[PDB]
Every structure is written in structure tokens, then in C-alpha cells.
Design a protein around this ligand. Structure first.
Ligand SMILES: COCCN/C=C1/C(=O)N(C)c2ccc(C(F)(F)F)cc2N(c2ccccc2)C1=O
Ligand SMILES: COCCN/C=C1/C(=O)N(C)c2ccc(C(F)(F)F)cc2N(c2ccccc2)C1=O
Ligand code: NA
Ligand code: NA
Lengths: 146, 146
């Protein structure tokens, strides 16, 4: 997630491995449990898409449940593009481009571009947007158990 | 916890009731379980003493376990005073005073004074210090189950 250092700068701070390890243990004990969702949202506060994917990849899960999660994310990303089309073409070096669904999901964006959108004014909270997509998918999983 | 708003300012953001509710459910299911500790540290990122006490009070627990926790905190606070004595007496209005153990524990300090120490340069991370005392006590509890 993003936090301000001892100067003023908004810097990225990776998620602690000990937090990740404890989290996977929680999910393992409360598989498909609704209470895990508010906890997921709590631990991902200020998280960038990169951080979110690290959490998702670390947890893993059932092949099938991961599918519904990915499909949900993909569906929401395509819905973002349908509503927020981005222009392709000429852009000067260092110019900020508008994020597409795949950028919000961290697939086609770097940590630096994610931080840029998140610390911009007006900000494009790509971390918050992606988290919502994930939570939608998690809420879908709990309701099928697959 | 403290977070920067849409201007630049370091503002306080209370813990979500939904997070608190989910957390108490976790502790209830994993009573005295070591894995809860890394999770406690994760959710209290950037937390002020006020936030920490809200979490502690919300969780509650066994009369006896709460005792060892309080006694541990009290013991560490007295140890902080023994090593970092603070001068009493004349101080101008609005002057920043050095925190004593009771201030770090949020007993004799306001949310505003806690934020002041935490956003000062060099900072007095009262939230981090208090969190360590709590985690020491939690590690004590797990090892007695009381
Ligand atoms: C470590 O795996 C052990 C067995 N549990 C697997 C699960 C699963 O298959 N998926 C795909 C995932 C993926 C990410 C997460 C996340 F960390 F993000 F929360 C939870 C989660 N949930 C889940 C979903 C909804 C509500 C509660 C838990 C599971 O139970
Ligand atoms: C809601 O209560 C249901 C039964 N569990 C009670 C417990 C207890 O009596 N105390 C005093 C506390 C107090 C705060 C916390 C905190 F939220 F901060 F983690 C955990 C905790 N732990 C605890 C201690 C060490 C490791 C894991 C859990 C307990 O089990
Ligand atoms: Na990437
Ligand atoms: Na207070």
C-alpha cells in the first residue's frame, strides 16, 4: 500500500510476508466465509493493484473458485472499458494515460503507473476500484461455494 | 489510523465498524491463537493509540486475559517512563509536550496530541510503540491461555 515517509512523499510499502502467511491461514480455516470479506477489505487499505494481486496469488484457493473470481474481475474490467473508453495513439514520453480495465487489474500497468493514478488530482483510485471488483467476486464465491 | 486526504493533509480515519465486527468474530473463533497476532498488527497499520484502544475494547475477552494484557501494558508504560522521564511544569499554550507512558497508551492523551507526535519531525511513533506493548501482552496471553 501507499504511505507517506519521513519527508512527505507518498511511497509504496509492500505487504509484510508475515501478514500474508497469517492471512492464508485465515482463509484456509474460514473457506467461503462472509466474515473474511470485511477482513480482506481491511487488510487491503491503501493497496495498489499490484498489492491486491500479491494477496490473491498468495491465497490461491480452489481452481474453480479462482475461476469465478477471475471471470468476475474480467467481466467488471470489460464493463469499465465499455463505460470509460480510453484513446489509443500518440502520447508524449512521461504523459499520464487514462487507465483501462486491464490497467486497474494490474495486468497491463506498472506499480509506478498505479501509484501515479492514485496520487493524482483528481485521483483515479485504481486500487479501490479493483478491490471492489475482487470483493464482488468474493461475494459471488461465498454464494456458490465454488 | 492516519491517512492523507485529497489535499495533502494527514488526517485521522476511524476504523470501520464492519472491520471491527469481523475482527471480534475472528478472535472468537481463534481464541489465544498465535496467527491472530500478525493479523492484529496488520489491521492496526498507521493506528493511533485511540484506534488501538477502540479495537481492544471492542474485542473484550476473558476477564483474566484482559488483566495480563493491561498489566503488561502498564508494566511497559512504567518502563518507558523509567527510561524516558518527562519534565512537568511550565509549558506555553500549544507547546508540544513529550509523551509519557500513559500518553502512549492513550489514557492521558487526546487523539489530537497523538496525531501531533506521530506527524512530528522527528516523529514520536506513539501508535507503533503502543502496538508493540499490546503485541507483547498478546504473546503473553497465548502462552498461558489466561
Ligand atoms: C487458501 O485456500 C484455502 C481454501 N479456501 C479457498 C478460497 C478460494 O477458493 N478463493 C478463490 C479465495 C481467493 C481469495 C480470497 C481472499 F483472500 F481475497 F479473501 C478468498 C478466497 N476464498 C473466500 C471467498 C469468499 C469468502 C471467504 C473466502 C476461499 O475460501
Ligand atoms: C472476543 O473474545 C473471545 C475469546 N477470546 C479472547 C481473547 C482475550 O481474552 N483477549 C484478552 C484478547 C484481547 C484482544 C485481542 C486482539 F484483538 F488485540 F488481538 C485478542 C485477545 N485474544 C488473543 C490473544 C492472543 C492471541 C490470539 C487471541 C483472545 O483470545
Ligand atoms: Na503489473
Ligand atoms: Na484519550
Amino acid at each position: 500500500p501507499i504511505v507517506q515517509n519521513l519527508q512527505g512523499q507518498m511511497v509504496h510499502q509492500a505487504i509484510s510476508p508475515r501478514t500474508l502467511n497469517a492471512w492464508v491461514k485465515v482463509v484456509e480455516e474460514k473457506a467461503f466465509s462472509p466474515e473474511v470479506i470485511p477482513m480482506f477489505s481491511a487488510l487491503s487499505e491503501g493497496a495498489t493493484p499490484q498489492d491486491l494481486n500479491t494477496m490473491l496469488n498468495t491465497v490461491g484457493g480452489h481452481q474453480a473458485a479462482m475461476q469465478m473470481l477471475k471471470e468476475t474481475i474480467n467481466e467488471e474490467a470489460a464493463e469499465w472499458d465499455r463505460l470509460h473508453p480510453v484513446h489509443a495513439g500518440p502520447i508524449a514520453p512521461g504523459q499520464m494515460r487514462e487507465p483501462r480495465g486491464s490497467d486497474i487489474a494490474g495486468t497491463t500497468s506498472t506499480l509506478q503507473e498505479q501509484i501515479g493514478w492514485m496520487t493524482h488530482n483528481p485521483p483515479i483510485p485504481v486500487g479501490e476500484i479493483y478491490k471492489r471488483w475482487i470483493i464482488l467476486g468474493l461475494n459471488k464465491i461465498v454464494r456458490m461455494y465454488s
